[PDB]
Design a binder for this molecule. Structure first.
Ligand SMILES: [Zn+2]
Ligand SMILES: [Zn+2]
Ligand SMILES: [Zn+2]
Length: 72
């Protein structure tokens, strides 16, 4: 995919690609909902996060329609 340092939603939109992603128990982003590597570091700093898996995914942090993601 393209080079970017931002949230991978930048790359995927609501289509999917293989990537590492995380759960956030603080934000109740669990099961099939989670966050990309950038958002885990930035938007969820000091939250209770955990590794989910590597697989087909788009970032639900970047996808939040209120624009609260800090990683574009
Ligand atoms: Zn993200
Ligand atoms: Zn969180
Ligand atoms: Zn984010």
């Amino acid at each position: 995919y393209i080079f970017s340092k931002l949230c991978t939603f930048t790359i995927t939109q609501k289509e999917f690609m293989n990537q590492h992603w995380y759960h956030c128990h603080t934000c109740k982003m669990v099961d099939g909902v989670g966050v990309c590597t950038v958002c885990a570091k930035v938007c969820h700093k000091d939250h209770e996060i955990s590794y989910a898996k590597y697989g087909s995914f788009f970032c639900d942090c970047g996808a939040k329609e209120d624009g609260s993601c800090l990683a574009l």
